[PDB]
């Protein structure tokens, strides 16, 4: 009834990998590319966040007022 635990095999995926002689290679490369595409997207945001953090340097300390108790 089921694949071994941890093994993945769907009807949908088998069809994709066996559609033609080089269908598998195509599937795996298109995934290698999606991966690079996401990694560069990460470095990009990391770089942007790093700049935004540099603007908050010092926080809001010099702008705080004592409490009127």
């Amino acid at each position: 009834r089921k694949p071994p635990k941890g093994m993945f095999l769907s009807q949908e995926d088998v069809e994709a990998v066996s559609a033609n002689a080089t269908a598998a290679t195509t599937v795996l490369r298109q995934l290698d590319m999606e991966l690079v595409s996401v990694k560069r997207q990460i470095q990009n945001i990391k770089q942007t966040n790093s700049a935004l953090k540099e603007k908050l340097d010092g926080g809001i300390e010099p702008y705080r007022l004592p409490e009127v108790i």
Partner: protein, 666 residues
Amino acid sequence: PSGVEGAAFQSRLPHDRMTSQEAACFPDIISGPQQTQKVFLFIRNRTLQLWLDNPKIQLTFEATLQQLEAPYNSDTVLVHRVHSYLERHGLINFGIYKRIKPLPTKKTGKVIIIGSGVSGLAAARQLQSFGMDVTLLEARDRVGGRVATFRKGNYVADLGAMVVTGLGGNPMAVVSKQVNMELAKIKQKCPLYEANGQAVPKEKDEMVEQEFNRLLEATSYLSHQLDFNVLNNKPVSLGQALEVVIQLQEKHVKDEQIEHWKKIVKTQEELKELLNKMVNLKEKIKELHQQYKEASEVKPPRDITAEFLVKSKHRDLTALCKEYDELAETQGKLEEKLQELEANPPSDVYLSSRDRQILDWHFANLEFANATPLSTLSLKHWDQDDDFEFTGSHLTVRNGYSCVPVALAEGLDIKLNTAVRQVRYTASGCEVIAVNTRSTSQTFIYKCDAVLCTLPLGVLKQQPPAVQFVPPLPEWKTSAVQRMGFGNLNKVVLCFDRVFWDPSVNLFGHVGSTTASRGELFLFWNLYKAPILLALVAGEAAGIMENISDDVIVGRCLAILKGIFGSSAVPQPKETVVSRWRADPWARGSYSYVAAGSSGNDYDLMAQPITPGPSIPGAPQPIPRLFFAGEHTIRNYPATVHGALLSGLREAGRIADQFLGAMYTL
């Protein structure tokens, strides 16, 4: 399983149920009351027990009746029927035993048996026992066929069959008590050494083997659940299925990597939005402070609007500072949630290069077992015979398997160096044409009532044919022959003058560098009295290595061993033998396999006798004349010695039934 139940199990029979074969001979019993069936089963099991208890002597009807107790020993006809039935089908009184009742002096019927391998020899002994005139025609200068032993000095090494796969239910268990056989257990520990010569750690070995088993299990799911058994009008092979499964696991590794990095961007993005809010909020705070500072410049006494301005700006500033502290709290949560994901990546690869090589060793091992590349095995039926496996430990014949056929040959009429060229079968008899292999012009004619053909499947496939059948075999038979697979595997025997390997280790592996060469000298056996190492060539390598000279093959073997045990430790071999089963004109391969596009039904087709048409128009339907035996003709035990042993017993019973008649069926 012990007692009478043990006897059934040891004879491959269900103890509490009658078989299809038994139904055919005892229709009166199987269709009658349950009680009578139970009486029959007990008589059958008990008769089997008496034989199994002492297979060195002929078990006679008289002997049987005397050893049975009441009330079973009261129905003498039923006992006699059961006895003749078992005897006729080779379940008792088969192999080599002391005969009590002498052989009938005058014989009945003439049978020519082509080939004197185990199937031929087993059939011949039976037919002789039943009182028929039997002659075996064997092409080689020896008996045994695919059971071939190398013997020189004290060196003994099997080039063909070598392993007895458990004695549980194995007919070879009976043979081993009759034929002088020195069985030795095969210790299953098998270390593997990578191409560089260094051993594979326990951890890898186990992990890879588990994966190998997981992948086999996976192809089974692919076959029975997704019904992936036909691709582009072509039957799917085990190899193909494994390749698909592996590709899917590689795909899953990449699918997980993607979802992992996508969680990082999603979070990394939430951070961006939060930081933007914080930067804008800091601007507002910066601005409010300035306004508050300016409002605080209007010193008192001041009107209430001025005071309101100071107090008002103060409140707005505090409120905003509270908003900033909350966002800073959220920043620390997201920041750590990222150091968490960054630290917990999913797997990098499904299998590294090293893992793949070790995995290929396991595939090579499977290719050895099935004597064929995985790309040729039927995904649907490659393991069709797994349910019939024997129990107990696997063993090797320490004194060489050939002791079996040599013993089975005792007292038989065997014509060695006689290659059959043509088999003629007609409504009134057969005529076999054979030549002397040492001078082909010398021709022999053998006339008989029936022909038992035990030519290997490899020979039957030869195109153009090595043996001509007249009339040609029908399409139902030839197509079965074309469909079935006929594999190959080879052995390299290395005889040394000293032991440089681990003597407590029966076998060890060599992991190849590439998939292409996985079967090349992948396994080494340490098995006999003498210091001998046996190297295995499997899968795609089997066929290719046949075209390589012995010296180059032996050189590679030595190179591998030197890499493992050290250069100075490995001396030149004193004697070396290399088998080439595919090139052998009398075998043309090693053993059958269930090819993609085939099935167990083809083994049944191989087994069906041929009945010639009448010689005279309008003359009644003849007797069958051409019979077949051999490992490739037994669906439940193909490609083995016991399978060949059984197939002969089967045909002997069918031939005797046809030509001597059956008195136990009435």
